[PDB]
Design a protein around this ligand. Structure first.
Ligand SMILES: CC(C)c1nc(CN(C)C(=O)N[C@H](C(=O)N[C@@H](Cc2ccccc2)C[C@H](O)[C@H](Cc2ccccc2)NC(=O)OCc2cncs2)C(C)C)cs1
Ligand SMILES: CC(C)c1nc(CN(C)C(=O)N[C@H](C(=O)N[C@@H](Cc2ccccc2)C[C@H](O)[C@H](Cc2ccccc2)NC(=O)OCc2cncs2)C(C)C)cs1
Ligand code: HEM
Ligand code: HEM
Lengths: 457, 457
């Protein structure tokens, strides 16, 4: 029906007029980001819309954003927008709620410290070499390289190793039952058929749950499920034991598996998308690539192996990474649910409303960014960075619920970039789409995969 | 989703563009009839639209109409558009399908013959008087009469008596458990919340069925359910025994009850709506009322009691009744489902499509009717009637599935009119809405009830 559809009318908040049942979902025909930018330009700092019957309050005010993601996090905006059905995956940290979440966050918080992460480099760099060897091969038969595939396999390599102790050159081995299963853990597309229907029929979620149907394909999960059985363990620098030790408030077995699936995915798919986009930028801006190559050679003599401290010394590398994250956040939106009524920065918001920060739109707003469409690493130099509002630029979220893997992701990505840029230069191929276009779907991804010419140095 | 929504595109049939999930239902915001007239004027003789995902093919071609309602009735278009949930009411003749239907149609066919119907007049006329006595009272305190209430109670009186043997002046007795229950059997409004949702979620019907939820309120049905227990019977001119005799292919007990509910309703609600609309027309056209009064006095001397044959002799009465039915059909649409694929008059129609004849629109079409908006009984005189296409004018449907009660309805209505017009004249009250407006909802009914000044003669 239409019971919820008078809400934003009642509070006097502007927004697209909802259709019965569908709310505003039809506006998603060209993707979240384009919907969010259209609505932002058309309504200013705040607006409201309905996913089916679910009210969503978009906010773009930096101070209101700090309020939701930080100040009122524990007391009001503790959880993300429920999404389901998920079976045992209800226990994964990113999905968990309230006290089950804070528990898992504490339990897993020590996994991603500079110390551990420091010990993860001699591992994460051994697969630096394999990627380079792989790349050099595919650059001797000098034909276009699909970044998502080569980075994909590196990305898988790194997490399987740092989290489970499993070494596999996944690129050559697309047939290892471990490689194939994990690959199938891809990001969910919220504008796909199944998810549109489940937004317009949330009253069906509990029906799917009962039938043990899940958004996480069962074949994928069940493998990884007991896959840790003889793996955890033979009865050191591994996410696994780092979690096993936390068992003997302590972590249950089926919860532990749910954490591993969550991570496997992250260190795999997020990482490889971002890496692809950086190389795309580097390839379409040779001067930036050359300046980056010079920072790398200067900090690391004759192809010297990167270390924890050398990585962190590279300023221009940091600016490149950040500037690619500005233009291509993997999140697009950040979201919390109000467990109770709230008044924030003068705005009343009833219990159950989804408050949504549209990062993609904010990352491209003319008010906060000069020439926001352009790839300009200099935006993040020492001179200009203090300019940037930490609640406008949020590629890893903010507050107690931000990305737990942030430091690992940044590190792992830069290690990859260094090893690759030390040995190669990248250039547009004939088939490189320029300018690149993002999938009109529900994921910040290229419609056509990035392909690039790889030249040895 | 949208799987069915390419159908009419595939067959090359014009029609409003469907929205995902909703199909065209939003077009119902101003009622079926207005939707059907808009679409007819805008697409000509045939068009297609979707109720949620259900395809509906509207047809206005007289010959194509004879094809659906008559020629291909038994072989293709045997059933009406399924509608549910209905519990045991699946067994009622108007809802029954295929062979269960033809069975019930044969079994109940002899109930409505000129002979039986002839024996039903000394009964149907005894309540002629009560209505007159009631009317005279409410015309001595000369204040406006709400037709739907006075006719309503007469309408109930007549069927309770002719079908069950229950005499009750229902108007004075709105407290008899028999009166109140039956009253609650009102026509279903297809554009009401519950029915809109169930058109956009037909996959929920079987869920409602399982929970014993029905469109026929349970309290209403259960009373009438066993209400016939000590009634059928004490172990003559009554629909009841007429059905009991057919038991001892023969009619089951719970089926019999389902038939009685179906009838009770019909002889009650259809009858009283039509009677109200005729009086409205008579009141807004005094000359027609006076001519009608003169036919009646001429055929029936000094307030002489109407008989079966006298009723049928009154030509101008027939034209009035028919002309009111033209302007205000109770059906609005007629519908059949294609059980199988079919090609009709050169048009292919796949299995499962609802073929819909929009009577309200057809009854008002400038191609078939001069000044179609105007109440002109003369349209149906001996001179002009043979003009009228029997597949354009269909107030009682056509073919093997037409109104089984037609002759009883026509008779019962005319008996009422004669007894009323012999004694009174009707006139607009101050509050009479003129011109009348039909509920923008899902039923041909007045938004504001007809109220009229009743003057004794
Ligand atoms: C009500 C129902 C119809 C709904 N379902 C959904 C699910 N869909 C499609 C989403 O895109 N949901 C989004 C989401 O992914 N939230 C997520 C946190 C997040 C948000 C943005 C960017 C990065 C991480 C929270 C979810 O638990 C996801 C689900 C998941 C798990 C494994 C593999 C794939 C996917 N888990 C993760 O965080 O993935 C690991 C990652 C870690 N860091 C970056 S990605 C929300 C921001 C809306 C939304 S609404
Ligand atoms: C799929 C689902 C969502 C749907 N449900 C519906 C139900 N609704 C609201 C309707 O208006 N359905 C219509 C209908 O009433 N069909 C009907 C035949 C008919 C059609 C038009 C005019 C007169 C009789 C067939 C149904 O069985 C009705 C239902 C009913 C029973 C008792 C009391 C009230 C209502 N039974 C009757 O015929 O009522 C007794 C009458 C006899 N003569 C005139 S009315 C159809 C023409 C569409 C349509 S689609
Ligand atoms: C470039 C790569 C990555 C980006 C851009 C990224 C970004 C994000 C963002 C935006 C969020 C949501 C923050 C919020 O709601 O405020 C998030 C959550 C999360 N990320 Fe990542 N992430 C990346 C890689 C990783 C990796 C490698 C891991 C490894 C485990 C990881 C684990 C998580 C977890 C567990 C959460 C949810 C934490 C919680 O709810 O408490 N992420 N990430
Ligand atoms: C003025 C009053 C009435 C009108 C205008 C009317 C009109 C109609 C119409 C249009 C139909 C559908 C026909 C079709 O699909 O082709 C119908 C069906 C029916 N009517 Fe009536 N009707 C009236 C009164 C009655 C009465 C008093 C009864 C008494 C029992 C009755 C019993 C039925 C039945 C049983 C059906 C369905 C028959 C079947 O499916 O086989 N109707 N009517």
């Amino acid at each position: 029906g239409t019971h919820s559809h008078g809400l934003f009318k009642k509070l006097g908040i502007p927004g697209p007029t909802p259709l019965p049942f569908l709310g505003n979902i039809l506006s998603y025909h060209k993707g979240f980001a384009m919907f969010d930018m259209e609505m932002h330009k058309k309504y200013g700092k705040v607006w409201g819309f309905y996913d089916g019957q679910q009210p969503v309050l978009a906010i773009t005010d930096p101070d209101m954003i700090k309020t939701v993601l930080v100040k009122e996090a524990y007391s009001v905006f503790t959880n993300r927008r429920p999404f389901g059905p998920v079976g045992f995956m209800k226990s994964a940290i990113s999905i968990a709620e309230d006290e089950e979440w804070k528990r898992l966050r504490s339990l897993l918080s020590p996994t991603f410290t500079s110390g551990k992460l420091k010990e993860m480099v001699p591992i994460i760099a051994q697969y630096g070499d394999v990627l380079v060897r792989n790349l050099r091969r595919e650059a001797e038969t000098g034909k276009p390289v699909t970044l998502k595939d080569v980075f994909g396999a590196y990305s898988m390599d790194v997490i399987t190793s740092t989290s489970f102790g499993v070494n596999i050159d996944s690129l050559n081995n697309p047939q290892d039952p471990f490689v194939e299963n994990t690959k199938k853990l891809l990001r969910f597309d919220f504008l796909d058929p199944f998810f549109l229907s489940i937004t317009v029929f949330p009253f069906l979620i509990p029906i799917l749950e009962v039938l043990n149907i899940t958004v996480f394909p069962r074949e994928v999960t069940n493998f990884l499920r007991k896959s840790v059985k003889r793996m955890k363990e033979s009865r050191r620098v591994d996410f696994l034991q780092l979690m096993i030790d936390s068992q003997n408030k302590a972590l249950s077995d089926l919860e532990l598996v749910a954490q591993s699936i969550i991570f496997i995915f992250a260190g795999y798919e997020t990482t490889s998308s971002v890496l692809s986009f950086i190389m795309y930028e580097l390839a379409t801006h040779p001067d930036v690539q050359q300046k980056l190559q010079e920072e790398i050679d200067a900090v690391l003599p004759n192809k010297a192996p990167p270390t924890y401290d050398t990585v962190l010394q590279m300023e221009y590398l940091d600016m490149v990474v950040n500037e690619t994250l500005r233009l291509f956040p993997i999140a697009m939106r950040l979201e919390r649910v109000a467990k109770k009524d709230v008044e924030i920065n003068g705005m009343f918001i009833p219990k159950g409303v989804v408050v949504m920060i549209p990062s993609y739109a904010l990352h491209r707003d003319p008010k906060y960014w000069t020439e926001p469409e352009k790839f300009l690493p200099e935006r993040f130099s020492k001179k200009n960075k203090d300019n940037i509002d930490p609640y406008i630029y949020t590629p890893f979220g903010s507050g107690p619920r931000n990305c737990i893997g942030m430091r690992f992701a940044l590190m792992n990505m830069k290690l990859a970039l260094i090893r690759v840029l030390q040995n190669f230069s990248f250039k547009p191929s004939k088939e490189t789409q320029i300018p690149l276009k993002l999938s009109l779907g529900g994921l910040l991804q290229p419609e056509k995969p990035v392909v690039l010419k790889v030249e040895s140095r």
